[PDB]
Amino acid sequence: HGSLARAGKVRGQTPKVAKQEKKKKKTGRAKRRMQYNRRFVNVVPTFGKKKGPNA
Amino acid sequence: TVTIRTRKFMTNRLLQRKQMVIDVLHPGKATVPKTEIREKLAKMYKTTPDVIFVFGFRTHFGGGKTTGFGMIYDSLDYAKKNEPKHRLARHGLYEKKKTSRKQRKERKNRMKKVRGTAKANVGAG
Amino acid sequence: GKCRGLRTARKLRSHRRDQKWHDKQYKKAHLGTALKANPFGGASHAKGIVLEKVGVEAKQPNSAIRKCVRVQLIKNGKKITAFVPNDGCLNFIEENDEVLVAGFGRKGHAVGDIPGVRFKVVKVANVSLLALYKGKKERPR
Amino acid sequence: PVARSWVCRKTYVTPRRPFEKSRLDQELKLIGEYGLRNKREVWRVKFTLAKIRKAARELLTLDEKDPRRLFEGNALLRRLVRIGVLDEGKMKLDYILGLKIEDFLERRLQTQVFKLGLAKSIHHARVLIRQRHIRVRKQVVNIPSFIVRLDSQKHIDFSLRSPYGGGRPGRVKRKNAKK
RNA sequence: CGUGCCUACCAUGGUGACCACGGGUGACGGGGAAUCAGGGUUCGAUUCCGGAGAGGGAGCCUGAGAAACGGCUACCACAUCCAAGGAAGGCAGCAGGCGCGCAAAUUACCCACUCCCGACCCGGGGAGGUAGUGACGAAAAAUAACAAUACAGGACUCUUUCGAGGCCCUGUAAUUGGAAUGAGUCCACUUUAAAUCCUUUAACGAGGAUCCAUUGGAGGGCAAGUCUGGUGCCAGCAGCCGCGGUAAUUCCAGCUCCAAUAGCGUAUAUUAAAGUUGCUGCAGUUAAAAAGCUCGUAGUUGGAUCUUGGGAGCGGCCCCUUGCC
Ligand SMILES: [Mg+2]
Ligand SMILES: [Mg+2]
Ligand SMILES: [Mg+2]
Ligand SMILES: [Mg+2]
Ligand SMILES: [Mg+2]
Ligand SMILES: [Mg+2]
Ligand SMILES: [Mg+2]
Ligand SMILES: [Mg+2]
Ligand SMILES: [Mg+2]
Ligand SMILES: [Mg+2]
Ligand SMILES: [Mg+2]
Ligand SMILES: [Mg+2]
Ligand SMILES: [Mg+2]
Ligand SMILES: [Mg+2]
Ligand SMILES: [Mg+2]
Ligand SMILES: [Mg+2]
Ligand SMILES: [Mg+2]
Ligand SMILES: [Mg+2]
Ligand SMILES: [Mg+2]
């Protein structure tokens, strides 16, 4: 029926972007420590009509 | 430096042996070796060192006590009689000289094949 | 409505053992036709050999040309329309290669975009298709 | 054939509903409050509290004058007192069910270090109990998941170690650099 | 040894709608395992007990014990050396090889422990034990941590303070250390039949080329972006609803988050949710479903009625019916 030539067209024509030099991430107990200290120490001035975990 | 104390102590007069549990305490350096523990126990029992054995040692996770089982005898002949050859092998009283696999079993098969004079020729050499 | 005596438990187990077959799951799990009719012989995965590469059509609201592989099995010897998962991998699946296959999400039904394909490609010639879609573990030939 | 040991106990319960926002916030504030690694060691405490509640409800099912109930209830109360969750007061079985998850996390090792000094920021107290620098008794403790019994409750030490036990772990590097 | 186990004669019995008989089992039976109200449902070849077999089935010596198979005999299917006339074989024992496969480990060491066997304190044991592969699975469990100096993004006690901070998270690719401790590198121990690993210890042993945490997702279920660039019903994503036809909250990539964490996704069998198998506990006017009506066997169920108030002694025995003589 249809043609079989168009395979991986978007993956081929998508221009590549180099992954930047991201710094290392603290993991495990340190990661749960920063997850607690990211959303449980300085959130209370905000109001419930808006939430900002990503924007 | 070290402190060697026996916790449990039994005596079997049937073999003239004295069994004990030995704790050697270390607030300091590494595990004191077999020969040095043997010499200190020989000095504390005030007899000859060649009659007292000990086996097994633990370590209670950071210095601490090392626990073993000590055997005080009263005769070297009784030590040769009532002890295994591998615990005589710590001081080299017994040697086997053929600690090899498949040698005994292949001599068994070469004696199983032939019989008599040829069996004495092949299996003994 | 029911039968609620003290000596009626044979009538109960008879009626329940009869009426338990009208559930679809019980009869497809305890009737032999769902083992001697399906492929795989009632297994999880199967190897197979590529026979051809077919561009099938999609359904009515979704207009797409899905890429499938007709696969000759080794265990039973049947023919299975498998499925090429990712955006590429049509150039990574060549002709007559060892292909491991599995299901989509359910044994009976299929995915609501492809009409008659129940099975999915996992490996290509003993090297994983996730590796062939990523950069590592390049193909032999 | 072989006969050594075959046993398999799981102190690990994944909850049914995976993603509840209030429960995830509760578990995150619990981890950030009591200084924990991951949520499986929250689920440990949750499963142990659940098993104690199972035993307590099985005892409360029984008749009051039953000798098995009296023996098992007195033994369970004795074990909870020697852990240190309960008190020497209410020795009833409903007082077992009237508990929370935070009591066992309080009776763990480093929270007793928080209540009795030498803690200095629980996330650093994790390091202080991993590295051999906090020693409940002559048998050295090396484990964060350590339930401190109330019968001793006061023995916090360290011997032959860096800050007071004595030694040059890496200050010999600094002395060789200056010399 | 009791047995229709077998024979001679005699009688016509024996089982079944309470399911026999006849088939199928991807059926070895149990103790048990998984699944969290209760009730149940599904596996159990597998380490303990019992049964059966040593390629198929038949027969048998020895022996107390075998229809034995690391015993023998004959047939069938394989299969070894053959100077061609004959011999010789059984890994569903321990390794290992081919094939089958989605699918499963080394031609290792030792009788040191457990025991077993024999004439026997001494010999033997791929029974076993130890080591090697091992992310089936279970328990503990670091991943750059940590307390300090400073720029302050500022939260908070209070004085018009545009700050006095003996309290707070945060980017600091900024410093200081304890130069924390671990993994590895290795001396000596210890374990051990001889060794390996944990444990004990001497000496090296982190400052971002560090000694680097992945697996999936970010429209709803279900946590997280109405971010940016291409692609423009093509590629594809999506287990379902659905997205993509030039402005994609779903494709590809980048950034940033989120889920659990040295265990995450996937497929399949199964369990709970499933009160969608309902005995607890489902329905039958219209959603799927009450036989056209009636009789009736087996089954299931079946009115009431026959021991009664009280006595001794307080804050358990009998009579006025309460073990028969
Ligand atoms: Mg489906
Ligand atoms: Mg007859
Ligand atoms: Mg259950
Ligand atoms: Mg149950
Ligand atoms: Mg029998
Ligand atoms: Mg047999
Ligand atoms: Mg065979
Ligand atoms: Mg045999
Ligand atoms: Mg054999
Ligand atoms: Mg995706
Ligand atoms: Mg995206
Ligand atoms: Mg959400
Ligand atoms: Mg999926
Ligand atoms: Mg219904
Ligand atoms: Mg209708
Ligand atoms: Mg109808
Ligand atoms: Mg009708
Ligand atoms: Mg009737
Ligand atoms: Mg009646």
Side-chain angles (χ1 to χ4, degrees), chain C residues 99-111:
Chain C
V99 169
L100 189 65
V101 291
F104 282 101
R106 182 63 177 171
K107 189 260 179 297
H109 294 86
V111 176

Side-chain angles (χ1 to χ4, degrees), chain D residues 48-63:
Chain D
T48 56
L49 182 60
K51 186 174 89 274
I52 293 170
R53 289 183 186 273
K54 293 288 179 65
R57 190 173 67 246
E58 185 179 1
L59 289 173
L60 287 174
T61 305
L62 295 175
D63 194 1

Side-chain angles (χ1 to χ4, degrees), chain D residues 70-135:
Chain D
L70 292 175
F71 178 75
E72 292 178 354
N74 196 0
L76 183 62
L77 288 168
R78 182 179 178 181
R79 289 178 65 190
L80 290 174
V81 168
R82 293 293 296 272
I83 288 170
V85 175
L86 304 180
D87 55 354
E88 292 87 3
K90 293 182 182 179
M91 294 297 173
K92 293 181 181 180
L93 294 174
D94 199 3
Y95 187 70
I96 298 170
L97 291 174
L99 290 175
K100 63 184 181 180
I101 303 170
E102 289 85 3
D103 289 330
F104 295 97
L105 295 171
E106 184 178 1
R107 297 298 299 164
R108 286 179 67 247
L109 178 64
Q110 61 178 354
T111 311
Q112 296 296 320
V113 181
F114 185 75
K115 299 295 182 182
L116 291 174
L118 197 65
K120 192 180 288 292
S121 296
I122 303 300
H123 299 288
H124 178 73
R126 298 285 299 172
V127 176
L128 291 178
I129 63 182
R130 176 59 47 81
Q131 304 171 358
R132 293 181 178 91
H133 293 89
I134 292 173
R135 183 179 178 177

Side-chain angles (χ1 to χ4, degrees), chain C residues 69-100:
Chain C
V69 174
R70 187 175 296 275
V71 173
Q72 183 69 39
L73 291 176
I74 304 300
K75 185 176 181 179
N76 197 2
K78 298 291 181 67
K79 293 181 181 179
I80 285 176
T81 60
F83 180 74
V84 175
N86 288 318
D87 297 336
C89 297
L90 189 69
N91 297 114
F92 288 98
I93 296 171
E94 292 293 327
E95 180 65 31
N96 296 117
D97 289 331
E98 292 180 354
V99 169
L100 189 65

